């Protein structure tokens, strides 16, 4: 409660920099107890975004966005139950330049965490955490769910995109540290994206008409979306990520004729 509400306020110092791990891991240990009210928690984290200064804004974001990704599950379940999340469309701080500049990536970020819990809402799971490979989630979904399921991380995929910030826009800690976590979510949200393709794919010929042709129009749209994915992973790669965690996409675009197989 006060040290809930303490270490929230510590997170979200004034300081240019990404939250502390300590109070970090402190707040994911909070997620993790049944006796601690998530509500209050969150209302807190909100709360710091109703600040002036685009510092403890943008901080109480990469706050949740960690919350989100390392906490228990609970904590995601109550983002998604509530009706308004962030408000934050017309951030502007004005108070100095690196103010103007960082106000335009709140607007975007904030959006994109939204946009994430709505589409846990919708499907009730979390599309970055699920089983991968040929026993999970993704791949063995019947054709109806599958055919419902894949426009709403097409949607999440186009929020997280739409940050789009370019190498040179990287120059403090703040914003830094919201693009590892960016990173992070990009990568999962792609494999199942295309866990997703490949599940089409293999059932886009054994399904009906109309079916088919909902198909082909996801199939059209993950295509264009492999080219910002791509553009995406670019930036990753000139800030210096290391090559070995960025995902090698060699990987299931040449079949554009089923655009036929409404013979
Ligand atoms: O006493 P600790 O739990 O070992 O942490 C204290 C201090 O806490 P206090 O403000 O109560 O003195 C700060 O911890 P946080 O407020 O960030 O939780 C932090 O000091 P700074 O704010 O100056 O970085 C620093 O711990 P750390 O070395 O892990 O950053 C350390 O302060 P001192 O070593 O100067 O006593």
Redesign the pocket.
């Known amino acids: 409660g006060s040290a809930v509400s303490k270490?929230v306020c510590?997170a979200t110092?004034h300081?240019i920099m990404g939250p502390?791990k300590?109070?970090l891991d402190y707040l994911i240990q909070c997620t993790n107890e049944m006796n601690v009210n998530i509500p209050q928690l969150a209302d807190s984290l909100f709360e710091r975004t109703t600040n002036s200064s685009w510092v403890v804004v943008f901080k109480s974001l990469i706050t949740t966005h960690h919350l989100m990704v390392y906490g228990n599950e609970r904590f995601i379940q109550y983002l998604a139950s509530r009706n308004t999340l962030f408000n934050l469309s017309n951030f502007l701080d004005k108070s100095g330049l690196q103010g103007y500049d960082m106000s335009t990536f709140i607007r975007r970020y904030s959006r994109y965490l939204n946009e994430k819990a709505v589409s846990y809402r919708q499907v009730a799971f979390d599309f970055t955490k699920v089983k991968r490979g040929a026993d999970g989630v993704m791949r063995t979904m019947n054709t109806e769910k599958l055919l419902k399921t894949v426009p709403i991380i097409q949607n999440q995929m186009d929020a997280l995109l739409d940050f789009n910030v370019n190498s040179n826009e990287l120059t403090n800690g703040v914003i830094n540290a919201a693009f590892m976590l960016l990173f992070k979510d990009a990568i999962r949200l792609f494999a199942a994206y295309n866990e997703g393709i490949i599940n089409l794919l293999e059932k886009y010929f054994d399904m009906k008409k109309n079916q088919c042709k909902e198909g082909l129009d996801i199939y059209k749209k993950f295509l264009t979306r492999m080219t910002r994915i791509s553009e995406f992973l670019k930036v990753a790669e000139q800030v210096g990520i290391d090559r070995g965690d960025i995902p090698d996409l060699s990987q299931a675009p040449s079949s554009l004729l089923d655009a036929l197989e409404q013979h």
Do not use: L, N, S, Y
């Open positions: 270490t510590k110092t300081e502390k300590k109070h």
